[PDB]
């Protein structure tokens, strides 16, 4: 195969930042120079990884789950929110790590390690998931998974929709939630849409918004038992529900809903 850059998850490998483009008032993608044109980062999908750095005398580290894959040679993906300064009252000092990122120039490099994480999708609807650290993974073969993310969550499941798409003879059907605090903030809209509409009898599609615009044909509020009803696959159709977002959203917004509508906790995997 092309050479691999993360052969070990406790080793550190500076990479160089080559580009970034603004995806909302926000979040960035931020791509890195892999050591070599021919590199690939090492992978295997729906894992992270994890930057490091001292950061005004204390030791940062973040995970960030790459939105590209082993098929990109050269670079590597991030899209990640920077948390500002000055603007929430809560949180005056805005995010360590993420303005930090915001802050570099191009050229400027930041230590990667992994990579992690107890999901790997290994194609035609298979997925190995690990029940924690210590154990061996179960693999878990589905014709449909439902996908919850709320803001940064729906990094993971890019990386997931994205390599099954690319796969003619996978005939996984992806259905997407995502929530957002207001249309605005709905990442990556353009490329979601794409999918859509190149994929859509492979990729269900469906926002909501904390707030909504006046006019909207999505939804609107925190996620609810409706939107699970009607915008994943139904239990009876034993799909693999995964999540991904903010802590609350997981444990007040999703886990009891998915309950209510009977999706069973073994066919759940919050990343
Ligand atoms: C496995 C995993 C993978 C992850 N992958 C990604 C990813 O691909 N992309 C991504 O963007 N994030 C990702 N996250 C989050 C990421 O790891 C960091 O937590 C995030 O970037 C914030 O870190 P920070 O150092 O900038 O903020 P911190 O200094 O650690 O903490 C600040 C916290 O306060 C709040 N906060 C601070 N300022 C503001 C503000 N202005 N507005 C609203 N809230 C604020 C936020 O909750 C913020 O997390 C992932 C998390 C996990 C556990
Ligand atoms: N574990 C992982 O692999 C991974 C990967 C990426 C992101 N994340 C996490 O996802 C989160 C993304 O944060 P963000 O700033 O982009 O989100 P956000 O603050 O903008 O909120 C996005 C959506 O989350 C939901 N939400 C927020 N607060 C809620 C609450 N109290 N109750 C119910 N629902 C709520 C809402 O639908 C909201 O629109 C972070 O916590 C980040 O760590 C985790």
Redesign the pocket.
């Known amino acids: 195969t092309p050479a691999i850059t993360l052969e070990n998850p406790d080793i550190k490998y500076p990479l160089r930042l080559i580009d970034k483009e603004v995806v909302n008032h926000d979040?960035r993608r931020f791509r890195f120079a892999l050591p070599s044109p021919e590199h690939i980062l090492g992978l295997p999908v729906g894992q992270?990884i994890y930057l490091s750095a001292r950061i005004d005398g204390n030791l940062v580290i973040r995970?960030?789950?790459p939105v590209s894959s082993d098929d990109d040679k050269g670079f590597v993906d991030l899209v990640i929110?920077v948390?500002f300064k000055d603007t929430h009252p809560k949180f005056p000092a805005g995010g360590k790590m993420s303005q930090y990122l915001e802050s570099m120039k191009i050229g400027d490099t930041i230590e990667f390690r992994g990579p992690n994480?107890l999901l790997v999708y290994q194609g035609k609807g298979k997925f190995a998931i690990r029940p924690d650290k210590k154990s061996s993974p179960v693999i878990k073969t589905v014709k449909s998974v439902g996908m919850i993310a709320?803001?940064?969550?729906?990094?993971?499941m890019l990386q997931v929709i994205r390599a099954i798409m690319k796969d003619p003879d996978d005939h996984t059907v992806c259905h997407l939630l995502f929530?957002?605090?207001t249309e605005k903030?709905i990442?990556l809209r353009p490329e979601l849409e794409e999918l859509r509409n190149e994929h859509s009898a492979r990729f269900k599609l469906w926002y909501?918004?904390?707030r909504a615009p006046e006019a909207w044909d999505y939804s609107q509020?925190?996620?609810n038992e409706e939107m699970i009803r009607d915008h994943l696959p139904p239990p009876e159709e034993e799909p693999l529900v995964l999540m991904?977002?903010?802590?609350?959203?997981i444990?007040?917004?999703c886990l009891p809903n998915l309950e209510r509508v009977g999706h069973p906790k073994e066919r759940c995997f919050?990343?």
């Open positions: 979040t992270h995970p960030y789950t929110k948390y994480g709320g803001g940064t969550g729906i990094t993971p929530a957002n605090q903030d990442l909501t918004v904390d509020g925190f996620v991904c977002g903010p802590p609350p959203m444990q007040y917004a919050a990343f």
